[PDB]
Every structure is written in C-alpha cells, then in structure tokens.
CSV table of C-alpha atoms (C1' of nucleotides) and ligand atoms in Angstrom, one decimal:
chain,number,residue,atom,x,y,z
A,9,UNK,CA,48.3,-0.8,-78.3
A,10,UNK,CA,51.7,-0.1,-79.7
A,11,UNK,CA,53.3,1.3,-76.2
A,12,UNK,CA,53.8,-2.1,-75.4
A,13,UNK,CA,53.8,-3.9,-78.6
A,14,UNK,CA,56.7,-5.8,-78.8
A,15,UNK,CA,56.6,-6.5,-75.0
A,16,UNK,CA,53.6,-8.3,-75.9
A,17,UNK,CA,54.3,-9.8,-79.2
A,18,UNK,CA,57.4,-11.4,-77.7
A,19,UNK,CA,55.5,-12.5,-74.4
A,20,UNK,CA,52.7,-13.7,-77.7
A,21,UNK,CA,55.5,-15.8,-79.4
A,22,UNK,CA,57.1,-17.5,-76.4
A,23,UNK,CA,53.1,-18.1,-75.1
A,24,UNK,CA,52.7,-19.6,-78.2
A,25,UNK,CA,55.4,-21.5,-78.4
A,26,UNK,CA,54.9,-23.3,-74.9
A,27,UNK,CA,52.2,-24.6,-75.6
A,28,UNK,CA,53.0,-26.3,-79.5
A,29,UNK,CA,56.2,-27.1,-79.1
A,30,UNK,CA,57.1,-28.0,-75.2
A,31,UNK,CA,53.4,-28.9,-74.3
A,32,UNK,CA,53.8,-26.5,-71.2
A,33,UNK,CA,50.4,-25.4,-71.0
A,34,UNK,CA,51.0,-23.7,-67.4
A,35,UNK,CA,53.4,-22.1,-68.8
A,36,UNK,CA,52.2,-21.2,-71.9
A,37,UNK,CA,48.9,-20.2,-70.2
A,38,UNK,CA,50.9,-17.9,-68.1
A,39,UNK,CA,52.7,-15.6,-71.0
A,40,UNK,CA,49.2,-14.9,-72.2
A,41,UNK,CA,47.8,-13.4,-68.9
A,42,UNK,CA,51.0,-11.2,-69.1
A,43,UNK,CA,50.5,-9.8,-72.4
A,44,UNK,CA,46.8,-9.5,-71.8
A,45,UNK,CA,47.7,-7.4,-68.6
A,46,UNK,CA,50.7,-5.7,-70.6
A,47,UNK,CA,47.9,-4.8,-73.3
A,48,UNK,CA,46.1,-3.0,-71.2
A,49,UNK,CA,48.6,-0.9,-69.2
A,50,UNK,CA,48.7,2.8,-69.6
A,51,UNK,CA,52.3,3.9,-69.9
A,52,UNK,CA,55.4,3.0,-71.3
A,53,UNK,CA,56.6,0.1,-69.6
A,54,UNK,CA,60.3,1.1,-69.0
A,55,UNK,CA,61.6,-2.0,-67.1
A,56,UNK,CA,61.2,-5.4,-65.8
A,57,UNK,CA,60.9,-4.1,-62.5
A,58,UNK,CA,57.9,-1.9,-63.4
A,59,UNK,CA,56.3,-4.9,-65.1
A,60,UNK,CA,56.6,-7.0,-62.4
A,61,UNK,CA,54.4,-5.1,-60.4
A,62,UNK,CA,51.7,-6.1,-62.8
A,63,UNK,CA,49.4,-9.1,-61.7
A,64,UNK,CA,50.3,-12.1,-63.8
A,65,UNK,CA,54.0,-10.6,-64.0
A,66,UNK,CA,56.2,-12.5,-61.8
A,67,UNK,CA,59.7,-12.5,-61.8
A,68,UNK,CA,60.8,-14.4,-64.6
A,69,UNK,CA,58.7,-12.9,-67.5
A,70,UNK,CA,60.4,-9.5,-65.8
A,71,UNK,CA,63.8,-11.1,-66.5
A,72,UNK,CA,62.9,-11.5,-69.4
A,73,UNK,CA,60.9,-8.0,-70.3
A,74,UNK,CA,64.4,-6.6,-69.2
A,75,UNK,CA,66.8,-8.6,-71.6
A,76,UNK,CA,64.4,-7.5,-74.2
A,77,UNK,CA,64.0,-4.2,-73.4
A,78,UNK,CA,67.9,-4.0,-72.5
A,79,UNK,CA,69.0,-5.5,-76.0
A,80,UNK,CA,66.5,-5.4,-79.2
A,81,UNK,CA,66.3,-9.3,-78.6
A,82,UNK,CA,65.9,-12.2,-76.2
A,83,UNK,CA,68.3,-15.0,-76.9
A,84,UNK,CA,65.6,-17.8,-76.3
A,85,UNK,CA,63.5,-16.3,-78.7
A,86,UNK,CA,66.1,-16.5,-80.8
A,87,UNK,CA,66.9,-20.1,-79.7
A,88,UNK,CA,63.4,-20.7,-80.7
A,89,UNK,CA,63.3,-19.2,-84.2
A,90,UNK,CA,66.5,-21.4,-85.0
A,91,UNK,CA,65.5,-24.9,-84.2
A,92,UNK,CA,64.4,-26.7,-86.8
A,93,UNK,CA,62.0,-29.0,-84.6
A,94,UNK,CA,60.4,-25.8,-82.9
A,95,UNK,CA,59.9,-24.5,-86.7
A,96,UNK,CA,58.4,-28.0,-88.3
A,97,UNK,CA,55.9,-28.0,-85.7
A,98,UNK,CA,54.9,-25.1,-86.5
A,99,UNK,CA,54.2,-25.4,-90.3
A,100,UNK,CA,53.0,-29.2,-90.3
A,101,UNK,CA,50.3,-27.8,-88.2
A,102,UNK,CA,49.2,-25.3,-90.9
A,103,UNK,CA,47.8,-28.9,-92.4
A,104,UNK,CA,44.4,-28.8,-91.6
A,105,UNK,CA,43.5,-31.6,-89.4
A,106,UNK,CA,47.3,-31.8,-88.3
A,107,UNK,CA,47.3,-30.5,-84.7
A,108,UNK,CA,50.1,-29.9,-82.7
A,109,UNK,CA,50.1,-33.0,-81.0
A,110,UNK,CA,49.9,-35.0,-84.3
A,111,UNK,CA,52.6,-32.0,-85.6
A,112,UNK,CA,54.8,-33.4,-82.5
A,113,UNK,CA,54.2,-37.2,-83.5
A,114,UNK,CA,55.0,-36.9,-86.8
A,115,UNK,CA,58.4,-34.9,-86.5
A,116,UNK,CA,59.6,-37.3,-83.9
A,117,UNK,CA,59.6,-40.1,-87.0
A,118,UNK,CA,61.1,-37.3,-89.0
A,119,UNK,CA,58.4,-36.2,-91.1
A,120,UNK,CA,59.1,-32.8,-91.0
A,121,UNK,CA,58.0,-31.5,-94.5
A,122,UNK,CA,55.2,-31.6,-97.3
A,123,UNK,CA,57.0,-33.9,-99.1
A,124,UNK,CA,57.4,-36.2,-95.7
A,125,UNK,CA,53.7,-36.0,-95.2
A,126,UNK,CA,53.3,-36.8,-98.8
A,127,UNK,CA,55.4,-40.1,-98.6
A,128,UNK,CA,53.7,-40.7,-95.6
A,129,UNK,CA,49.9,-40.3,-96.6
A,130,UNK,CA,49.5,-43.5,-94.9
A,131,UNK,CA,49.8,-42.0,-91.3
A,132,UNK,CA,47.7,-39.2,-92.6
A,133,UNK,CA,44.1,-39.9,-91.6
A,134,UNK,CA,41.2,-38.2,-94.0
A,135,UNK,CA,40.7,-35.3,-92.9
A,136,UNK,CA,44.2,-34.4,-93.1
A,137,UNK,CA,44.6,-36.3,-96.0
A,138,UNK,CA,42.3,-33.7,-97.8
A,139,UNK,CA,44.1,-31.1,-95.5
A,140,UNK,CA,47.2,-32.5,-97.5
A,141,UNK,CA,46.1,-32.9,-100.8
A,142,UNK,CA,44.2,-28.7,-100.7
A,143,UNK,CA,47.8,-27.0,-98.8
A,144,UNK,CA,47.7,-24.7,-101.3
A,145,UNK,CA,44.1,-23.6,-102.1
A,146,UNK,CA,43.3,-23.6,-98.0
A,147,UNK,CA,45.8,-21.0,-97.8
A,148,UNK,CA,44.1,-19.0,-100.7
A,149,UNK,CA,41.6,-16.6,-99.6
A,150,UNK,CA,38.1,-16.2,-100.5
A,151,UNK,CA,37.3,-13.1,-102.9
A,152,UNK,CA,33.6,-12.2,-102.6
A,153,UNK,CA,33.5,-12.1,-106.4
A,154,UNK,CA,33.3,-16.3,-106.0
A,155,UNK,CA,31.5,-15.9,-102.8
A,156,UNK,CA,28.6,-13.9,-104.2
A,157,UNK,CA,28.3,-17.3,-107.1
A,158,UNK,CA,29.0,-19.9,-104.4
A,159,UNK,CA,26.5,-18.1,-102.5
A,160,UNK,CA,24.1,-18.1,-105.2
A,161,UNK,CA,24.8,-21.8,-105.3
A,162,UNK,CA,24.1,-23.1,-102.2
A,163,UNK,CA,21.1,-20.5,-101.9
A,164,UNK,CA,19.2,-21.9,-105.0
A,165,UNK,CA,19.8,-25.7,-104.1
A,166,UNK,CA,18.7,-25.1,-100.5
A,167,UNK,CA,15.5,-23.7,-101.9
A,168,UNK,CA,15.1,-26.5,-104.9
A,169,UNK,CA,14.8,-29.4,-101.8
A,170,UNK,CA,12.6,-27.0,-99.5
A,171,UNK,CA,11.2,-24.3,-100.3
A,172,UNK,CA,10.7,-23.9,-96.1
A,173,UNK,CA,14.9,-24.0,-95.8
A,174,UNK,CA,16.3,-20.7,-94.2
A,175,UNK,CA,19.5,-20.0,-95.6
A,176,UNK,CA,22.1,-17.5,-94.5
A,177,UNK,CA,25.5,-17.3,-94.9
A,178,UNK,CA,27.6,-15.5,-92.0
A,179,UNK,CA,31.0,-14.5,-91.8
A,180,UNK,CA,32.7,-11.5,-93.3
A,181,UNK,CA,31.1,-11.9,-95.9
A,182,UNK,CA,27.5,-11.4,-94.3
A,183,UNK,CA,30.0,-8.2,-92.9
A,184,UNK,CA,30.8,-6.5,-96.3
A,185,UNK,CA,34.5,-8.1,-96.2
A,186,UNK,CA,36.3,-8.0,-100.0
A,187,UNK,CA,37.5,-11.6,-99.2
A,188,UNK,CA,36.8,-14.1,-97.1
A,189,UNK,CA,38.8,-17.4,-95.4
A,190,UNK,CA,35.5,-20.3,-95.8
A,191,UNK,CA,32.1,-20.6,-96.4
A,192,UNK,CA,29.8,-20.7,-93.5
A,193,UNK,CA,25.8,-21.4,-94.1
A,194,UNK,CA,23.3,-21.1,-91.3
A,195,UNK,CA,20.6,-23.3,-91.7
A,196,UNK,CA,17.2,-23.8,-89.9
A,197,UNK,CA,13.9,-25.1,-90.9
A,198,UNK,CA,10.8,-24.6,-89.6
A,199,UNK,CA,10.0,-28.2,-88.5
A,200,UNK,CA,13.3,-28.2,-86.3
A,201,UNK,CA,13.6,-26.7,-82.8
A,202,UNK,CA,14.3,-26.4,-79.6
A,203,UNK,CA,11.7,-29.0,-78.4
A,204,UNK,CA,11.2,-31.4,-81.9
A,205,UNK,CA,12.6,-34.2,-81.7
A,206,UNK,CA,15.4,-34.1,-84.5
A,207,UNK,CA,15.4,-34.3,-87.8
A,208,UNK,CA,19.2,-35.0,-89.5
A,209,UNK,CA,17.7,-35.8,-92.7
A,210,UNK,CA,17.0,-31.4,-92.8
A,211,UNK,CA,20.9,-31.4,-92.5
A,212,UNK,CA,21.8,-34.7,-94.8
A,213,UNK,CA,19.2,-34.0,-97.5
A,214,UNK,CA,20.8,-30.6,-98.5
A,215,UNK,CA,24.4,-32.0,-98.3
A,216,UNK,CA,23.7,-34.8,-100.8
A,217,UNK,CA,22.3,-31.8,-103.4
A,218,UNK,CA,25.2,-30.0,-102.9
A,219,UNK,CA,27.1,-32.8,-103.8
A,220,UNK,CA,24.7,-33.8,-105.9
A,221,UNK,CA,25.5,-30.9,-108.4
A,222,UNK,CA,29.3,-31.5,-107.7
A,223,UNK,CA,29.3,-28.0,-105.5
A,224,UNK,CA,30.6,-30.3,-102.5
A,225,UNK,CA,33.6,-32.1,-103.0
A,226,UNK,CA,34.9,-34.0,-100.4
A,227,UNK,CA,33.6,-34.5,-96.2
A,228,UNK,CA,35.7,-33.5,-93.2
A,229,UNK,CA,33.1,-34.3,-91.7
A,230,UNK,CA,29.8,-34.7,-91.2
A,231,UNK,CA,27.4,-34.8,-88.3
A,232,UNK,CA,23.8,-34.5,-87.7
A,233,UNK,CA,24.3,-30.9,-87.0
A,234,UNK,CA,27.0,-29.9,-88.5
A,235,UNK,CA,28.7,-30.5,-92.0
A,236,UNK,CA,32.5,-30.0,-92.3
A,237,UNK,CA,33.2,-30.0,-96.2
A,238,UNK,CA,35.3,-28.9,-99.5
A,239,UNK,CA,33.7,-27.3,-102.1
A,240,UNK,CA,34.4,-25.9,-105.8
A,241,UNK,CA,32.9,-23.3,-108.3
A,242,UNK,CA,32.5,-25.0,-111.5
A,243,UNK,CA,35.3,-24.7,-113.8
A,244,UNK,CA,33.7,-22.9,-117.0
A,245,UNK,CA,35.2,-23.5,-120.0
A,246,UNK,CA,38.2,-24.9,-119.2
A,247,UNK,CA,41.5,-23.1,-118.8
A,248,UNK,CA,40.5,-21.4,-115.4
A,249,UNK,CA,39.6,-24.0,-112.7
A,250,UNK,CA,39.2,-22.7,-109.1
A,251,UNK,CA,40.7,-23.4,-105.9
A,252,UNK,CA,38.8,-25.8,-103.4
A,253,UNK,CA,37.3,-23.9,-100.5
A,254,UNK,CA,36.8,-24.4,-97.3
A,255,UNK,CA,32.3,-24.5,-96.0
A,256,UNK,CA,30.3,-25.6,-93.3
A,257,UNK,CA,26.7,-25.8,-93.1
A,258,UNK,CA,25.4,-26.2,-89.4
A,259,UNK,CA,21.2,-26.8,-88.5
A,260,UNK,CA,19.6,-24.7,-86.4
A,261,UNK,CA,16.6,-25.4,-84.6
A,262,UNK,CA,14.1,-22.5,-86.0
A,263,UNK,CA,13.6,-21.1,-82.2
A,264,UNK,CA,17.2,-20.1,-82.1
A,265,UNK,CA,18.6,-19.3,-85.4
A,266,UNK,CA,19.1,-14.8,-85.4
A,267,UNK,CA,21.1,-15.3,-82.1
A,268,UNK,CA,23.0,-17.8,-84.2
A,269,UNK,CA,22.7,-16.0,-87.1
A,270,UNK,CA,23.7,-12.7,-85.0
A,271,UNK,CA,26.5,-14.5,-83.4
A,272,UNK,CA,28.0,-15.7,-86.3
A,273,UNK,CA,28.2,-12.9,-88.2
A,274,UNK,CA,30.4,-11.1,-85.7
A,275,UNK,CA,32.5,-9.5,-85.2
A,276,UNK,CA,33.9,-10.7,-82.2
A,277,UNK,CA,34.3,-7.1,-81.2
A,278,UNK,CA,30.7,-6.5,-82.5
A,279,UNK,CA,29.8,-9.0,-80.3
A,280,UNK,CA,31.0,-8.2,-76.9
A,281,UNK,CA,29.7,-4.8,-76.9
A,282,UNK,CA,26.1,-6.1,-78.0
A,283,UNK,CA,26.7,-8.5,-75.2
A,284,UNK,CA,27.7,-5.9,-72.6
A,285,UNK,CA,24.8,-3.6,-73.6
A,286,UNK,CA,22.4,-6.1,-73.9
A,287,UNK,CA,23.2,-6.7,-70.1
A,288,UNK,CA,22.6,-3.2,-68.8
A,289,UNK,CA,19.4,-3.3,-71.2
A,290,UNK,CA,18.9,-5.9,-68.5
A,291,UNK,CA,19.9,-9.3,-70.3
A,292,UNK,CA,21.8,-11.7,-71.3
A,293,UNK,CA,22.8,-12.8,-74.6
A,294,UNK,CA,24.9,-16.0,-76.2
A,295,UNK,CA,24.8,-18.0,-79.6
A,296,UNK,CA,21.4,-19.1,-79.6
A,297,UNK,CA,19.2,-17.1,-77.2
A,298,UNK,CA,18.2,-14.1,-75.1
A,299,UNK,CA,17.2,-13.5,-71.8
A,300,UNK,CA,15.9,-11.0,-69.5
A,301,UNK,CA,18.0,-11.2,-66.8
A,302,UNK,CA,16.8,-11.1,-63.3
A,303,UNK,CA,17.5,-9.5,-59.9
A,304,UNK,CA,18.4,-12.1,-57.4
A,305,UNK,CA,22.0,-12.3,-59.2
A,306,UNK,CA,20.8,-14.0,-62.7
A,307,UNK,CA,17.7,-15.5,-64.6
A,308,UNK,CA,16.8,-17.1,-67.4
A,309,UNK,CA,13.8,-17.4,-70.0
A,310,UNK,CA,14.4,-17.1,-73.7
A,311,UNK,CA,13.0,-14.3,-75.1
A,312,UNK,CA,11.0,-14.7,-78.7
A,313,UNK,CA,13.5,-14.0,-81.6
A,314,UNK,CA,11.3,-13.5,-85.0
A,315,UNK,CA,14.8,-11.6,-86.9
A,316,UNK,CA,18.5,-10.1,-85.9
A,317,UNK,CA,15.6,-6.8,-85.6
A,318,UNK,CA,13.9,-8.2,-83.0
A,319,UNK,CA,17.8,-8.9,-80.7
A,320,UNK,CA,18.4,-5.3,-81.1
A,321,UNK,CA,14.9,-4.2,-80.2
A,322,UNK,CA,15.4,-6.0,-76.9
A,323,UNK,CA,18.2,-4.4,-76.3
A,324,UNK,CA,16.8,-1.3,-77.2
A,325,UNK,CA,19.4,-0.9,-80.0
A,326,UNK,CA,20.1,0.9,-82.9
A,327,UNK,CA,19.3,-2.2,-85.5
A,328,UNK,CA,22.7,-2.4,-87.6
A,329,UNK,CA,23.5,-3.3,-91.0
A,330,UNK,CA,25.6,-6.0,-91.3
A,331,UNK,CA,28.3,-4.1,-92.6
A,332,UNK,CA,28.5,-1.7,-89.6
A,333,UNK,CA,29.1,-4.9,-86.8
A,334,UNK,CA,32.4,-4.0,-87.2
A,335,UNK,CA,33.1,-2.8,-83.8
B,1,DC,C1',31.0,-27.5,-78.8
B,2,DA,C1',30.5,-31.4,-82.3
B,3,DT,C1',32.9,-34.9,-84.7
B,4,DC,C1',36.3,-38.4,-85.4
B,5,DT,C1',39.8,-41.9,-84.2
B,6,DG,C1',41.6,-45.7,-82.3
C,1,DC,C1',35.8,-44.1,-73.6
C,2,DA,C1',39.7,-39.9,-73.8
C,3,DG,C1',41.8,-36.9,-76.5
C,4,DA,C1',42.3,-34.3,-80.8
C,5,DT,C1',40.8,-30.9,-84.3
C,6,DG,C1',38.4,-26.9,-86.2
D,1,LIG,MG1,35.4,-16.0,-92.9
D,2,LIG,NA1,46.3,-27.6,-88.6
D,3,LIG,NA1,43.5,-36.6,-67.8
DNA sequence: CATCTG
DNA sequence: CAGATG
C-alpha cells in the first residue's frame, strides 16, 4: 500500500502506456498483473531478484524493478514522459469520444492539440465534436450544491410525464460525495420488465421533456435503454451561466432495478464485499439480480427484490445508508 | 454492455 | 458486420 508504491506506480505508467501509445496489449496486460501481484506483497521488496520470484514477474520487469530501485528513475520512463507523440496521445484522449486509437489516427496527420482538433472539427465525429466543444466544463466537477437542483430537475419532470416513473439517481452522490463527475438516473417503470416485451417510448418520452424544458442539451447518444447526454442548470439572471454536465439515464425493467440501483451506487469496494458476503450467505449477486446459490457447484433463480432492504435482508445484512457503502 | 460509425 | 467509446 505504500511499501511498494512506486514499484507499482512505475510498473502502472509503463502498463499504461503499452497499451495507448504502442498498442501492446500483451504487454501492457502483463505490467498490470505485476503491480497487482506487487500490491499485494507483504514486505519491502528490496530487489529485482526478489520480485522475480513473484508470479507474473519474469525477468524483464525485474530488470527493470532493479534500475528503478538502483537509481530514483528508469530511463524508459523517462524516454516516455519526453516524447511528444507518447504525451499527445495521451491528452487528445481526455476528448471525450476521442479514444486512443482515434488519439493515434489523429497525431499521425499531426493533430496533436486543441487547436488541431479545432481546425479539424471535420474529422471530429459528434460525439467528440460535443466532447470538443465542453473540454473545459467535462473537466469541471460536479458540486452537490447543483446536483441537489439538477436532481430536483430531472425528479419533478420524470414525475410530470408518469406519475408511475421510479427515479433514482446513483453515484456519489446517492453516497454523500461533496462533488460529483456526471449525472446518473436510474429509471424503471412498472410496465417494463424482465418478461414485457419493451417499451422505448418509457426511455424516449422522458428524454424529450428534459429537453423539452431545455435541461438536456445535446445527445451522445441515445438508445432504447440507455441515454448518453449533456445537460445545463438554467442560467438565472444572467451573469452566472453554468458549465455543461455530463448525465445518463438508463431503463430498467421494474423486476431488476435495487440490484441496479444497489450496483450503481457503489462503491466498487462496497460492492465486492456485499458480493463476497452475499455468497457465504449462500448466493450470488450481480447488477440486476440475486440468487440462491446451489450445491452441485452453482445455481440460479432470481430472488424477489421489492427495495436495496430486501438485497441486504437476503444476505442477512446490516441494511446500510447510502452514505456508509463506502467500503 | 449498449451505442455508433463507416 | 467489426471495432471503438464510455
Ligand atoms: Mg460520479
Ligand atoms: Na476520451
Ligand atoms: Na480480430
């Protein structure tokens, strides 16, 4: 946790960089084992040679655990933090809708900057045309002081088209978090499940509202399911306008929405250790259901979900606040 | 995993 | 349809 820190921040940046820049995926794919196995290892790692007795640590990622450990450096990671094509890739891609591959595209015909993409907003397609045009306010986060109004927003169109809708919006925010990244609604309606055959008007009907009071501003995109979109507190009396946010509403068929909903709101961490315990409670848990998990290795069945209470219960947990999913 | 592009 | 993105 900070015995091995650098060892795996380094062994983070040169994963991280096989697999944006070079496309080496392998290899990429093999730093990350590394520091995963690094992570959890006990004592101090001293040298390469004791590293390389790890599983996932051959010999060159020990060659290279030494020069670091040897000198406060590692020349390729220095190579790396140099080159200006290594560095474009990486800050084209904080476009939204600009991958790496498209990050790799792009530099190769030299557009390398904001201002190149800008020139160029005829290679741009939409979504990272928006992605282009919001840089700034995607990079802004989300206070909850705006949340709690957008919030209150969505929430009183949803109800205004159907007064069946189910609402709920995840996140950190859902987790008492100060500030958030994006919006993310949960939706379900009574009339959609499991079974029922469809319904994208419960998804498209809300979205036009939204959009109908100006809320929504622009579509990443938007699926029967599952909305992508940009979206904007009112400007009140002009002087004070505010930044364009990030949302997404996703439909939930009825039957499954509190695993959803339970799921979403994470944490991750929150979630693993429901998942674990839900397992010795003798089950089995994912994003949209539960089940009682059988003898003969596994088994299935869906246990009845009425609220995030009822999860718990099935567990046999101690129900907690949303707050307190932390870890 | 759902959506989009081309 | 593969392949990219979030
Ligand atoms: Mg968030
Ligand atoms: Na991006
Ligand atoms: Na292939």
């Amino acid at each position: 946790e900070t015995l091995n820190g650098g060892i795996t921040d380094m062994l983070t940046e040169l994963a991280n960089f096989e697999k944006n820049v070079s496309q080496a995926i392998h290899k990429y794919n093999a730093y990350r084992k590394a520091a995963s196995v690094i992570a959890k290892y006990p004592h101090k790692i001293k040298s390469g040679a004791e590293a390389k007795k790890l599983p996932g640590v051959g010999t060159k990622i020990a060659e290279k655990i030494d020069e670091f450990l040897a000198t406060g450096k590692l020349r390729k990671l220095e190579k790396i933090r140099q080159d200006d094509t290594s560095s474009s890739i990486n800050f084209l891609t904080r476009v939204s809708g600009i991958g790496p591959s498209a990050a790799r595209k792009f530099v190769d015909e030299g557009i390398k900057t904001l201002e190149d993409l800008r020139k160029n907003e005829d290679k741009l397609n939409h979504h990272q045309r928006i992605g282009l045009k919001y840089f700034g306010d995607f990079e802004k986060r989300i206070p909850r002081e705006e949340m709690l109004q957008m919030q209150d927003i969505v929430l009183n169109e949803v109800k205004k088209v159907d007064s069946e809708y189910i609402a709920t919006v995840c996140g950190s925010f859902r987790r008492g978090a100060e500030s958030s990244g994006d919006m993310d609604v949960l939706l379900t309606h009574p009339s959609f499940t499991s079974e029922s055959t469809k319904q994208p008007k419960l998804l498209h009907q809300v979205v036009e509202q939204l959009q109908k009071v100006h809320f929504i501003t622009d579509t990443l995109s938007k699926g029967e399911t599952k909305f992508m979109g940009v979206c904007q507190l009112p400007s009140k009396n002009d002087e004070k306008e505010y930044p364009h946010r990030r949302i997404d509403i996703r439909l939930i068929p009825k039957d499954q929405y509190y695993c959803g909903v339970l799921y979403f709101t994470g944490s991750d961490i929150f979630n693993k250790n429901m998942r674990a315990h839900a397992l010795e409670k003798g089950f089995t848990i994912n994003e949209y259901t539960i089940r009682p998990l059988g003898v003969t290795g596994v088994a299935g069945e869906p246990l009845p979900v009425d609220s995030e209470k009822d999860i718990f219960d099935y567990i046999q947990w101690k129900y907690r606040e949303p707050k307190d999913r932390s870890e």
